[PDB]
Amino acid sequence: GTFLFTSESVGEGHPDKICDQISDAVLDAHLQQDPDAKVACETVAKTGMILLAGEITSRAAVDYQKVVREAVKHIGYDDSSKGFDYKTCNVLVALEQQSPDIAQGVHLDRNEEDIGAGDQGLMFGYATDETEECMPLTIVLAHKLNAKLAELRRNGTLPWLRPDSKTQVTVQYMQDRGAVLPIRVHTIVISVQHDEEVCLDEMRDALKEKVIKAVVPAKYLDEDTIYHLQPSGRFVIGGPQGDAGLTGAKIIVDTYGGWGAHGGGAFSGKDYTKVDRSAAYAARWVAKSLVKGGLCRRVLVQVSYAIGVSHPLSISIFHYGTSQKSERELLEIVKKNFDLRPGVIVRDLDLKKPIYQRTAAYGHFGRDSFPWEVPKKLKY
Amino acid sequence: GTFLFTSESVGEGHPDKICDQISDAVLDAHLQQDPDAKVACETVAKTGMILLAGEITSRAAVDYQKVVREAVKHIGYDDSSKGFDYKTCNVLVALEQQSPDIAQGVHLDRNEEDIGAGDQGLMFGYATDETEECMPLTIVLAHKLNAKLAELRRNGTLPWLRPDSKTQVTVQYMQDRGAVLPIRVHTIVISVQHDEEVCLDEMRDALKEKVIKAVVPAKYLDEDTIYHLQPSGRFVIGGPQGDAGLTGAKIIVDTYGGWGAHGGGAFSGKDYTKVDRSAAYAARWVAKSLVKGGLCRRVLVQVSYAIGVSHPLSISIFHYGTSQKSERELLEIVKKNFDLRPGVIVRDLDLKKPIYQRTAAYGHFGRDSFPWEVPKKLKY
Amino acid sequence: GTFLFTSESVGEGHPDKICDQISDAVLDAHLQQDPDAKVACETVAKTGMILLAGEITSRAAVDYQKVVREAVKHIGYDDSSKGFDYKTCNVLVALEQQSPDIAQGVHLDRNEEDIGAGDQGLMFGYATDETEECMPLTIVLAHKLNAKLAELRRNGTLPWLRPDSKTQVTVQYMQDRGAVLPIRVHTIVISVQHDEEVCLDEMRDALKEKVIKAVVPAKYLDEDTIYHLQPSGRFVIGGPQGDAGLTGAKIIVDTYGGWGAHGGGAFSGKDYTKVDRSAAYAARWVAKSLVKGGLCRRVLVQVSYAIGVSHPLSISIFHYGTSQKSERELLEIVKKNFDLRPGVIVRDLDLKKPIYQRTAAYGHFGRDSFPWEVPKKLKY
Amino acid sequence: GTFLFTSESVGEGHPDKICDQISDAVLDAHLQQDPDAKVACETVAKTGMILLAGEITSRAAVDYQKVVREAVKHIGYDDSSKGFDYKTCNVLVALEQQSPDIAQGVHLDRNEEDIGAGDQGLMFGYATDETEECMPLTIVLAHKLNAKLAELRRNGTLPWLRPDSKTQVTVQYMQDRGAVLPIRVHTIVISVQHDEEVCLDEMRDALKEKVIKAVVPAKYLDEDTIYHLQPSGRFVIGGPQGDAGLTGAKIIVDTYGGWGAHGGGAFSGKDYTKVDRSAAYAARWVAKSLVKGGLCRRVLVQVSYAIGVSHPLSISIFHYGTSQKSERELLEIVKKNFDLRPGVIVRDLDLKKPIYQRTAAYGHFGRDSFPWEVPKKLKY
Numbered sequence A, B, C, D: 001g002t003f004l005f006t007s008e009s010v011g012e013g014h015p016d017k018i019c020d021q022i023s024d025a026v027l028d029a030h031l032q033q034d035p036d037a038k039v040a041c042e043t044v045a046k047t048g049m050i051l052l053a054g055e056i057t058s059r060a061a062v063d064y065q066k067v068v069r070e071a072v073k074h075i076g077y078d079d080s081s082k083g084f085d086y087k088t089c090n091v092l093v094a095l096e097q098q099s100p101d102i103a104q105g106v107h108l109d110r111n112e113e114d115i116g117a118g119d120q121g122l123m124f125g126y127a128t129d130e131t132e133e134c135m136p137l138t139i140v141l142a143h144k145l146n147a148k149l150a151e152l153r154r155n156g157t158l159p160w161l162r163p164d165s166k167t168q169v170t171v172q173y174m175q176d177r178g179a180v181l182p183i184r185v186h187t188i189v190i191s192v193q194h195d196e197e198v199c200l201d202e203m204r205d206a207l208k209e210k211v212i213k214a215v216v217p218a219k220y221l222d223e224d225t226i227y228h229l230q231p232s233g234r235f236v237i238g239g240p241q242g243d244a245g246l247t248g249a250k251i252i253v254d255t256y257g258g259w260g261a262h263g264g265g266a267f268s269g270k271d272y273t274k275v276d277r278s279a280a281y282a283a284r285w286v287a288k289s290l291v292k293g294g295l296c297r298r299v300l301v302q303v304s305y306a307i308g309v310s311h312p313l314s315i316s317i318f319h320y321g322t323s324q325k326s327e328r329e330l331l332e333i334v335k336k337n338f339d340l341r342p343g344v345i346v347r348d349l350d351l352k353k354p355i356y357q358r359t360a361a362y363g364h365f366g367r368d369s370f371p372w373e374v375p376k377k378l379k380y
């Protein structure tokens, strides 16, 4: 009656995550001066290069060189010895205004509450009572392992560490009436970029004793836990030099780690009129509100939109059998309590605030009491 | 006892799909001369620009200008009036060899069968008996609507059509003992790029009569079906001019349309040593083999890997209650019948063959009897 | 006692000249809002691509997409059939602020009159009484042949013409006491981009009858004049698709066509603190003032600078024996009448005015009564 | 009876010279495998970026990443502390085949001796007996000052030096019957990039004692010589980070330092069919042959071409009055002794040999006994 499930996470210096952070740094910079900026900023990273590509219509005056370079500095890529340096990399910009055809279809001449969805699409929200963060344990652990790497790099404990890292956690679970109950960590993978001087045994020892043991509750570890620590044997070349980065290339890391579902919409570099972002945030908020309200233990919420249309086209609720209420009753509760138009979500979740760079590593969900992580008290 | 579910698809000229097709055109070109080419080719598209970024180690001599431009020609972007032209766009290349640290960790000096996974990661396979293609109806319909658009453009029936299109289908379902049974199409969205001369009513009439009616079985349509046809009102600007494209930005379109799950791994531009591609293909093959073998009606398969390690770290099977066999029994059957090392999958699925461009629109699954769509006869 | 001399010119759509015009369009846009903008804008052109590279510190808010695209529209590249289209090309920007090390060395905290030269360098000015424009006949004719091409393209007389063109004129001269006296046109070359429909004989006939005969005074043409008209035989591919363009790649076309001398400094995309521009303009002004003042018939002026130093390091005057005054006397006259500090030249020549795009085809000298073409009355 | 004249030179790490060296490295790499490669490679450099733009048709298999990066390594940009690093910069490639319209006009189906000029244009050759190298003293000194900088950097004498440098020398001359006779160095400018630790007085002292005194014969220096050493006061930011680089942006540095004349044709990145290179080299060879043959002391040679035509359109010889022979007699001698078709020059000067990178700093003329610097014995 047990099953395995695996999730992964990446660190701040993973090339895809560099792009997500830069795109959201660019978005925040616009929003700081123009709360109504229309932003759709993709970032591409390869050896020595940050390229911004996409569409921005805004009143803000933004110094892209500064914004990009400060983001890469925060990540820690500050010397050619590390494979990338904010001081001396190439920053190229291919940014145009938003298509006027889109603008006229979505928001021009509309009352804010009634703005159309910025695109079509489908979005899911998920919550699970298995952790206090209402998130899968597999992904929560994976994220914390990367955060611990960054901490130890930054505080000088493990000065051989670089910014690019990946982690993966397999948990063995049992189920109870459709809820899931973690039993033990089955397998942990950690790969992290490193300097030329440190040997593999020192790294593997440090990853076990200073990272894994510092993060994973000991009740979940036993003698049969499998560790794959620096399994490649060598990871000196890293960041964009080792592997190309794109914005929106970590959508599963950003969300639920393989649990629930995903509609395909990336978050980073988009203002609230992009329902890929605002409706996914709202959907998480719905799902979390249902669980923390005691109406279910686990729940998946789907919504979907058409470009130019303000109201969702479909809402669906799946409770995995973890409620005494029917799924149709939960749907009636959601419909009574939430207004999932983007022009209303923006007010409920304060989505014109320039806090997006903070979302762009370690997952958008399950941390920091962002507005979509504060449950709505439900009337029913 | 009914529920709604929504999936989307995009056409060949959607800017993300242009990138996926180009990346796979580049991969095929390498594989045509060097079956063992190591390829990790991302493509970025914006107004007038195709950029290739990533890592390729190969013996092939490839003319990137020709390969890229022929792919964009096939898609149909051949004049500045359409917003993009293969004859005159910019093709920029930022391609390096594969990192030697990766190469030494994964494949150098290894027997082919025992090559390590090209990366860590998690991958799901899904199959459902609701259609002959073993795919969700929502996504199958969405894909066929885009294919019909392309057909009508190409044959000159609707010469006002351009290549960039999106579709979305919401089906109303009932469930039966964990299987799903489609009842009716609830909502259809179609947005498609068009010329400056055609009016909106002509387009909406054509989308209803020549596209939707030609594709959706009439038993699924009724008087309450909701149509959102060119809901933006105007879509003259399109392709990379309207919206930036990236490779791997359509991973849900490429797979199961929101059903099942996704581990986050994009397919296009990667050779078989990238388990994001090979293991996802194998997982689909497993799932399809279970359903077509009559062991379940619906099934989700997870596998996961570590870089440099040949065997999967975890396998999990979820049958939604649609089998008399336990999930653990299905897992024992999968373990008996499949070898999910990448160096074995490559032989079973013939993944050195240059057929990848064909996968890169209209979904990787549910069509054309690709090798991963031919069920394995199971011993148990 | 005769000699041949050859000069060339290029048209507005020659890829190097596209870059010069774009760089000066960018400069003008800055100067329109911030008269003290520091601008060093290089432009690179290839198939489908305009890249801006360089350094700009300015208070202006400039829409590079608009500025670039409007410049390419003015040139006439507006359809993929012509090989380039302002509507749909890629505009990439790699622009940073001026180096603070340069800024502190040249202008920060300085009184305007005493700003240092923006760089080291040498610059020449030249004037010759052989034409009313005080320019060599060879280059004046070459420029007018390109201007006539553009006129006939624009007015629809020769609608098969495209924007990319080159011309070259060889004149046979005699000398008189160091002045030069044109006798006849020896050879004319014209190459111009064209459509796919027009045949070579129609083009060659039109180039002779509608272009050459319309431009070159008939006294200079005879039966032995050699014509090389579309000598390549085919010129359908042109503009940046046929040949890469760079700013500052037409410095001889921009100046004296091989006569006099050149110190190596390009003009386009630079504000007045760049002495490559301001001192060359001043030097032309000196040379023209000497000739129109009747102090010589032909004259070459050299000046040179060091970065951060306001006054020139060297001034030299060479009159080819065409004055009764010694060269040292002409030098004393120049020193009495001109102040060749950049912070003074800017006032004399009004070099903060946004008129630079107009300079960037058909030569910077010998036309339009620009301020450096209005002779200073000399005191001596 | 004296006059001043100024020339400049730049060092190997000047951003324009980086581009010239890279373009010629790319050319050499092609020529190493395919002696008939058609190459027209421009290079653009800015912070963190090397872009190759242009046209190459060749049978060679060239690894642009290696070729570019090895060239930047040779120059000395190997750490982010220096502002640029060959290990980690971005190398972008926008290279297409040669235009088929050009190819058919110039060389396809032609006997090699009779290939047409690769373009129209004018080119000058110059030689002067004032130095053993037959070059102006002003430019020879400027080049040697940069070479001494590189030597002292490379051998560790002045380890605070970086690769980017500029120099400028003003010589006071007298004339003798049209020959020029250097008397003294009037002014020297040196600007060189440096580390953050060295103070200005140490630099200025070293530039005087270790560079200028090591290079300039003491007979040319006196107490009135003016020195402008690090005149900006600070030059820590340098290379492509301080200033954009382009190929062909140092054409006066590459040739005669302001003496003689220039037709506008850049050398680097072009195979011999580009007469900008081959005919300029031949013209230098003619001029040097005239002087070393004792037919004049100083001489300027002009030639010019039309695209597709093998023979020059015009030849002109100007001896400044430094011969007893008339200019027309020298012209008859040149015509008797030289064949200035590009398909013949290639044989005389061995221009398919991959030695071009060596030409791309410190001037193309006056050094190393390149074939165009070995005088032809003249028959007359």
Ligand SMILES: Nc1ncnc2c1ncn2[C@@H]1O[C@H](CO)[C@@H](O)[C@H]1O
Binding pocket: A014, A015, A016, A164, A165, A166, A191, A192, A232, A233, A234, A235, A236, A237, A238, A239, A242, A243, B099, B101, B102, B105, B119, B307
């Ligand atoms: N040598 C290596 N060993 C393990 N992981 C690596 C290595 N190089 C890169 N990676 C990580 O895996 C991803 C894909 O190659 C990169 O973004 C990086 O985070």
Ligand SMILES: Nc1ncnc2c1ncn2[C@@H]1O[C@H](CO)[C@@H](O)[C@H]1O
Binding pocket: A099, A101, A102, A105, A119, A307, B014, B015, B016, B164, B165, B166, B191, B192, B232, B233, B234, B235, B236, B237, B238, B239, B242, B243
């Ligand atoms: N004006 C429009 N109306 C509807 N869809 C559009 C429009 N412009 C672009 N799109 C589609 O939506 C996506 C996101 O803007 C694009 O890739 C494109 O396919």
Ligand SMILES: Nc1ncnc2c1ncn2[C@@H]1O[C@H](CO)[C@@H](O)[C@H]1O
Binding pocket: C014, C015, C016, C164, C165, C166, C191, C192, C232, C233, C234, C235, C236, C237, C238, C239, C242, C243, D099, D101, D102, D105, D119, D307
């Ligand atoms: N086929 C051709 N015939 C003549 N001139 C050309 C041709 N193609 C390009 N050119 C011109 O010559 C230059 C160098 O190839 C280009 O900028 C262009 O102006």
Ligand SMILES: Nc1ncnc2c1ncn2[C@@H]1O[C@H](CO)[C@@H](O)[C@H]1O
Binding pocket: C099, C101, C102, C105, C119, C307, D014, D015, D016, D164, D165, D166, D191, D192, D232, D233, D234, D235, D236, D237, D238, D239, D242, D243
């Ligand atoms: N701070 C400086 N001082 C002097 N010369 C410089 C400085 N920065 C750059 N340069 C040189 O002058 C050129 C133009 O700015 C550059 O290529 C570089 O060689």
Ligand SMILES: [K+]
Binding pocket: A243, A244, A245, B040, B042
């Ligand atoms: K990648």
Ligand SMILES: [K+]
Binding pocket: A040, A042, B243, B244, B245
């Ligand atoms: K996008």
Ligand SMILES: [K+]
Binding pocket: C243, C244, C245, D040, D042
């Ligand atoms: K060129």
Ligand SMILES: [K+]
Binding pocket: C040, C042, D243, D244, D245
């Ligand atoms: K520059």
Ligand SMILES: [Mg+2]
Binding pocket: A016, A244, A245, A246, A249
């Ligand atoms: Mg990735």
Ligand SMILES: [Mg+2]
Binding pocket: A119, A120, A121, A264, A265, A266, A276
């Ligand atoms: Mg989407």
Ligand SMILES: [Mg+2]
Binding pocket: B016, B244, B245, B246, B249
């Ligand atoms: Mg997209």
Ligand SMILES: [Mg+2]
Binding pocket: B119, B120, B121, B264, B265, B266, B276
């Ligand atoms: Mg992955």
Ligand SMILES: [Mg+2]
Binding pocket: C016, C244, C245, C246, C249
């Ligand atoms: Mg040119």
Ligand SMILES: [Mg+2]
Binding pocket: C119, C120, C121, C264, C265, C266, C276
């Ligand atoms: Mg200069």
Ligand SMILES: [Mg+2]
Binding pocket: D016, D244, D245, D246, D249
């Ligand atoms: Mg320069």
Ligand SMILES: [Mg+2]
Binding pocket: D119, D120, D121, D264, D265, D266, D276
């Ligand atoms: Mg030329």
